[PDB]
């Protein structure tokens, strides 16, 4: 149970601060866990998502289908993954939205200020 | 001497003149439904002329 | 209406008493407010009583 009067355990005050979050706070809401390879390779349980990762779906009807993060859509709170494709009736394809809690990252798209993001969280290089 | 029409800008940004007809028909149907339900109410409370005459005395 | 064998009681409620009542819901808010002003006045003046 909480022990402060700064944070609120109210349902309306929590869901409002979720649904009207800014587009720089939705980044840390959309996070994903790492693999058994990546967790023992870095030392981080979960990172904020970033486009052009390589990901795997562990819950849902597309379980096992790996892919590449095509465009993280933090307005519909989701992320369209390549090779996660619904054939529309018109012969075209649409990418199917996944929520990033139900993903798992396997091959990461590193960068500076991600090699700092790991090391502030206590990982390796 | 135009290379710009009405339709030239709107064929690029979103809508298409076949789907525009499938949008224009939906507004005029929803304008009917919002003008029906106002006449479903105002006809009851409109005869209340607060300064009537009742023009028959003698 | 003077109905029964009851005590003749006077209630001073002719006025607009509803706009001026103060139901003290503060009674346990401005006690822990006071027990912090007896701590800021215990820390600001540091060894004095």
């Amino acid at each position: 149970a909480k022990q402060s009067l700064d944070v609120s355990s109210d349902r309306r005050k929590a869901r409002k601060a979720y649904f009207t979050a800014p587009s720089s706070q939705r980044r840390v809401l959309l996070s994903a866990p790492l693999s058994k390879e990546l967790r023992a390779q870095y030392g981080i349980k979960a990172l904020p998502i970033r486009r052009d990762d390589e990901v795997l779906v562990v819950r849902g009807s597309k379980k096992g289908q790996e892919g590449k993060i095509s465009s993280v859509y933090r307005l519909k709170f989701a992320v369209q993954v390549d090779k996660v494709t619904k054939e529309k009736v018109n012969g075209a394809s649409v990418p199917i939205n996944l929520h990033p809690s139900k993903l798992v990252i396997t091959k990461l798209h590193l960068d500076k200020d991600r090699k700092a993001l790991i090391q502030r969280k206590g990982g390796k290089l | 001497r135009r290379t710009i029409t009405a339709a030239d800008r709107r064929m690029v940004s979103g809508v298409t003149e076949k789907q525009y007809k499938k949008g224009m028909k939906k507004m005029q149907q929803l304008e009917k439904n919002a003008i029906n339900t106002q006449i479903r109410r105002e006809i009851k409370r409109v005869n209340f002329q607060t300064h009537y005459r009742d023009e028959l005395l003698q | 209406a003077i109905s029964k064998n009851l005590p003749i009681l006077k209630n001073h409620f002719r006025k607009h008493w509803q706009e001026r009542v103060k139901v003290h819901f503060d009674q346990a808010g401005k006690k822990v407010s006071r027990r912090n002003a007896r701590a800021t006045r215990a820390a600001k003046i540091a060894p004095r009583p």
């Binding site: 149970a1 355990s9 349902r11 | 106002q38 109410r41 409370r45 209340f48 607060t50 | 009542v21 139901v23």
Partner: protein
Amino acid sequence: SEKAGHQTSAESWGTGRAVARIPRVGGGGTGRSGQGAFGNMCRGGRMFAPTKTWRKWNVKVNHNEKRYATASAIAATAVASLVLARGHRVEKIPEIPLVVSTDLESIQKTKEAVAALKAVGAHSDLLKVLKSKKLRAGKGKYRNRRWTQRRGPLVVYAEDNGIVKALRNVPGVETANVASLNLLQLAPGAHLGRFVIWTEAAFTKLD
């Protein structure tokens, strides 16, 4: 609110029309003008004798009555046929008083306190309190009263070194000192008997 339905200036049309006598929103134009107001029965009016903020929220009890009820509940704790009939699983508990040693007051880790409760016999009671997590019924569940558990055993120390820090987290288990023995904690929901685990520093303080 004090103007909950009185932000509308209406006045009746007397008698001489074919409509009711209630204050009607005069004027014209929009769909409103012609409705009723100011009544308990009009749509969009005040309620009947509206609920005011000066009720009797808190109520007095004679202090000796409160010390009577607490001393009654403490005595009702120590009968086997009350705490079992209250709803606590006190079946395979060897002694109804259930005094433990005073080394419970120095425990600090919840892993090292839950085993200390399972040893003295709350193993079929913590399971009772965490297999019983159900959802609240009706409109309360969106007023921060969403879940509903049962109540568990109440361990009572005499001077704490993190026993309350240990058992704050586990569901159902409550802590208390012997001063401030709560009637709300001791007969929860007006039913007597509560599976109270005394430590011996408390059980010799209770004298």
